[PDB]
Amino acid sequence: MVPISPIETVPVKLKPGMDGPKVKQWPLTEEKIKALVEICTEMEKEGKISKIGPENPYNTPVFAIKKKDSTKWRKLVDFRELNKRTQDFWEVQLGIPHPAGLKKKKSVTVLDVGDAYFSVPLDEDFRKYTAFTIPSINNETPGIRYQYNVLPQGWKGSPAIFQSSMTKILEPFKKQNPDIVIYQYMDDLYVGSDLEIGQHRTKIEELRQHLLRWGLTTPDKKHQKEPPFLWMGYELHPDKWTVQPIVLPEKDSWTVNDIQKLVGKLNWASQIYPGIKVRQLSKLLRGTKALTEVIPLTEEAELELAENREILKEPVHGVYYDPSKDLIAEIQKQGQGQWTYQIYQEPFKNLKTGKYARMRGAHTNDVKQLTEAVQKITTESIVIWGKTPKFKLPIQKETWETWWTEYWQATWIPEWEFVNTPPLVKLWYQLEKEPIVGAETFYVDGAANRETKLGKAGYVTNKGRQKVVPLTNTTNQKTELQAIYLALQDSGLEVNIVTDSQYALGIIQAQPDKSESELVNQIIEQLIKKEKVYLAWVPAHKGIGGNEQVDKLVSA
Amino acid sequence: IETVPVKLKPGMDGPKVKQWPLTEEKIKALVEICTEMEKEGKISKIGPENPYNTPVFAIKKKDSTKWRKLVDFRELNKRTQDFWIPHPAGLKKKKSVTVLDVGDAYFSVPLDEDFRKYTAFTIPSINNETPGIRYQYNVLPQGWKGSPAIFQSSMTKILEPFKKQNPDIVIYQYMDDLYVGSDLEIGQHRTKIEELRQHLLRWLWMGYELHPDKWTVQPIVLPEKDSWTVNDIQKLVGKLNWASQIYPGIKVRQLSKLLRGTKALTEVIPLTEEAELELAENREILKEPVHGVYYDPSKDLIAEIQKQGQGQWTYQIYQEPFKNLKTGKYARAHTNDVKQLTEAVQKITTESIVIWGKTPKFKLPIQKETWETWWTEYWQATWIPEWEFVNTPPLVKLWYQ
Ligand SMILES: COc1ccc(C(C)=O)cc1CSc1nnc(C)n1Cc1ccccc1
Ligand SMILES: [Mn+2]
Ligand SMILES: [Mn+2]
Numbered sequence: 001m002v003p004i005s006p007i008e009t010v011p012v013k014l015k016p017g018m019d020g021p022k023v024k025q026w027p028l029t030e031e032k033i034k035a036l037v038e039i040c041t042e043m044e045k046e047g048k049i050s051k052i053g054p055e056n057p058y059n060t061p062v063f064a065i066k067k068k069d070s071t072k073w074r075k076l077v078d079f080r081e082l083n084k085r086t087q088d089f090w091e092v093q094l095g096i097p098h099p100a101g102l103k104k105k106k107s108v109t110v111l112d113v114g115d116a117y118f119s120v121p122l123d124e125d126f127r128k129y130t131a132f133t134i135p136s137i138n139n140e141t142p143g144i145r146y147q148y149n150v151l152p153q154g155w156k157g158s159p160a161i162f163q164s165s166m167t168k169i170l171e172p173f174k175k176q177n178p179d180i181v182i183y184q185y186m187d188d189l190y191v192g193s194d195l196e197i198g199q200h201r202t203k204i205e206e207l208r209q210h211l212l213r214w215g216l217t218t219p220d221k222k223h224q225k226e227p228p229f230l231w232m233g234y235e236l237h238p239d240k241w242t243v244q245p246i247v248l249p250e251k252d253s254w255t256v257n258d259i260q261k262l263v264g265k266l267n268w269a270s271q272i273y274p275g276i277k278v279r280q281l282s283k284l285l286r287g288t289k290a291l292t293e294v295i296p297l298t299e300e301a302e303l304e305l306a307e308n309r310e311i312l313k314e315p316v317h318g319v320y321y322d323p324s325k326d327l328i329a330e331i332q333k334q335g336q337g338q339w340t341y342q343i344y345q346e347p348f349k350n351l352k353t354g355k356y357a358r359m360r361g362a363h364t365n366d367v368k369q370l371t372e373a374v375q376k377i378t379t380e381s382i383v384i385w386g387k388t389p390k391f392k393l394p395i396q397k398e399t400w401e402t403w404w405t406e407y408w409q410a411t412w413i414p415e416w417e418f419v420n421t422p423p424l425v426k427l428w429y430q431l432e433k434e435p436i437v438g439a440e441t442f443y444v445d446g447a448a449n450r451e452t453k454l455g456k457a458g459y460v461t462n463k464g465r466q467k468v469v470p471l472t473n474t475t476n477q478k479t480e481l482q483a484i485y486l487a488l489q490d491s492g493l494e495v496n497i498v499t500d501s502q503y504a505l506g507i508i509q510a511q512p513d514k515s516e517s518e519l520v521n522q523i524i525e526q527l528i529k530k531e532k533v534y535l536a537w538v539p540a541h542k543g544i545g546g547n548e549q550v551d552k553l554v555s556a
Numbered sequence: 557i558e559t560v561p562v563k564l565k566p567g568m569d570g571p572k573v574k575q576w577p578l579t580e581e582k583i584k585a586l587v588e589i590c591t592e593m594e595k596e597g598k599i600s601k602i603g604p605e606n607p608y609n610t611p612v613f614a615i616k617k618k619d620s621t622k623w624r625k626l627v628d629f630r631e632l633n634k635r636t637q638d639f640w641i642p643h644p645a646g647l648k649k650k651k652s653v654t655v656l657d658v659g660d661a662y663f664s665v666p667l668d669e670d671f672r673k674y675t676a677f678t679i680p681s682i683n684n685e686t687p688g689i690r691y692q693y694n695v696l697p698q699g700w701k702g703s704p705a706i707f708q709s710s711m712t713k714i715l716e717p718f719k720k721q722n723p724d725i726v727i728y729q730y731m732d733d734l735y736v737g738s739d740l741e742i743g744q745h746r747t748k749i750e751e752l753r754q755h756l757l758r759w760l761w762m763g764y765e766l767h768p769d770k771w772t773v774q775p776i777v778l779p780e781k782d783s784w785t786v787n788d789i790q791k792l793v794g795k796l797n798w799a800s801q802i803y804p805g806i807k808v809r810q811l812s813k814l815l816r817g818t819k820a821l822t823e824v825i826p827l828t829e830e831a832e833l834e835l836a837e838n839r840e841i842l843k844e845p846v847h848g849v850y851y852d853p854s855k856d857l858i859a860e861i862q863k864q865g866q867g868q869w870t871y872q873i874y875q876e877p878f879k880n881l882k883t884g885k886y887a888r889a890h891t892n893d894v895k896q897l898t899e900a901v902q903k904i905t906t907e908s909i910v911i912w913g914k915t916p917k918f919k920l921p922i923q924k925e926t927w928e929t930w931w932t933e934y935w936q937a938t939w940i941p942e943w944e945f946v947n948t949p950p951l952v953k954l955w956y957q
Contacts, residue, residue: 090687091607160604372925382579410926435821545812
């Protein structure tokens, strides 16, 4: 007996005020009962379980299911009830590692530590709550009572307690081998280094010896899996990574469930495949959650999906990370609130790609959207590589300077350079800060009857120009925007506009270049055509010159 | 050398706040800082049976180059049983006030063993390569609202030889900071506070300098002009109309009377003598205080900030709309708006601590995603206030311009 080191026990409790489970053992067939007795006897001689008595009042149901293609029954202990009443753990895997974040390494080896799940002891005071009963044949004797001594397969705390135990075991090996990186994922240890293969396999052999200190057996060299590793939906090769093959469903009668499942698959592909578009495919799910109805699609969605199926035709791969090279992120405007980016260190060798879609809202502009995309790529890059990348943006330095100095919010993007890749993000209009000398002054106003929805929009100017237009199916807000649109339509290239609409001012001062209201869009189009616009606000119903004159014209 | 019983509020569990991403240099700084704290017993590693978490990050304090660890205990502070510090009203009236970091005194006092699990935090790893390095506190943590409360018994006894040697000095404790105020000349103020340092030494190196400004609430000012255009008068009537929500007898009838017709915005309008009288009476009204403005300690303080451009920022602190308790203007990175806003928030919060002994809730002129991405890069204080975001440009920015 070479003395093996014991594994620390993690103290486990149940939820406050809650008690252990008591679920009836369901009637099982004599065929199943015999199979469970043989399974539990071998597990007992292995130390995984032990017989208990009638003192223990807790119970968890046990089933027997045949492994398909095999004539071998397997045991299944349904811990769904004890899990509801087991304390919350610090859970495993806060986030998923991204392959683009792996640093370039010479060799990587996988060790299967699956033999260790049942080599971790369970908290002694908690074993009482893992009790289960093998029902007797014909139900003529008391059932065989068992409890667990190790982390059970399917118990709530087994994943977290297993990984925490491996972490403590692996800590002295990492410290005394600083040139070795180790990633644990379930029953696998990914061991990588930049040593030449001879010195690498030597270190692997030392790790295998170190794991045997706690009686943990691993697969020898001949039985270790080879690259590529299929892991969390990726294919990982020694120098390149890509996603696993994306298979689409091919039905001509779609449902809401599978259209939910394939937008997540197109998004999955978009992390390496460039130009993935899901906009028209995603606007079909608008507020309809029954998962069994059909809906066709448009002349632009199949045009964006004709290439979506054709983009996935040739495999594309990402590269791994060199911390000694710079990290670069480049963004393109795709139109219709869609944006794509690439993260790379050397030209045309991407670490990864991605897309950004604008936040929902009534009014927006391209600079705000680019700002948001920048912030998203910044956070994503901190996660994956621990640093902000350098940005290449399709916006001029002067455009950005004008934007953030005049914008009413505080805004900021990190270090970036201009890249001349059309279409460029630009400011489409800039309102004046002072009244324009020599330009006609339009006093605008609109009003609507809340009951009949009838209203009027109009202006009067300092040169005696006037217009009032009657409107049907309108509101106070719409008449005030329409009034401004009329003044813009009927004035020269330079114009002063006086409104009392705090609503209209709040929209225009947010500087939208696109809107979901066609009225605001027409105003935007007029603003683009003007050379100078000064927009002034006055309080309503105060007898302001011009404003009081047009007010009585449109509220009649 | 013994712990005090500490519990949570009834029906509430410990905090389970997600750790946000950290750069490599901040992760490494926290690894080094926490390694030494562990050797000194201040914190200990924890296992998977602790499901609680509080965010942690790293700052470089004002006028220093070494990283400091900051724990965002905002959620735990909301959930911890209240401990029952009468805020000294004389502190706001002193000529000068100095802020001394005394947070390191907390680490010599043990934390209740049953409560320690609730202080859990995680040093994240890059790219989720490992599970985070998980720690919990064994001693009173900096940033926890229970730390000054528990240490208040001991802190009082350290200061009494000083407080009776100087009955004129006002000393107030908020979080990890000591605020020390007097009416002396600045030279004699520097010296007496260097005297005050001779207690944490016996029984920490830097200090912040503060002076109350001329007005608690800046007066509303109207232009003084010799020729008024139509535009000038429209802007004046708008500001007077807005101020009439704050002040009782503001009249604009005679000034609106000048805007009679449909005139060009740049045409000069002579003021009549009745309009000049109305404007003059409005000036005298605006030089009185606002009626019915009182602090209620049971209600939250709200702080609004407006970006005015060219590095200028205006703010107002209130509990009730149009009942401002304090207004001000922060000015002078000429290229980073977010850094400026973050410094204004800290300056307004410090003023709020001195005046009322609590922090206000901010209304920030910034998009959430921009602020949450960057504010930790410029934060320098050991407390953190609450904030919300303003997405529609308020017309009010003009009136404080
Ligand atoms: C599933 O695979 C993971 C997942 C995560 C990690 C982490 C986070 O270190 C490592 C690995 C091991 S793979 C890995 N680790 N580093 C690199 C580079 N690679 C890619 C590679 C593949 C085969 C041969 C040589 C290099
Ligand atoms: Mn109107
Ligand atoms: Mn009107």
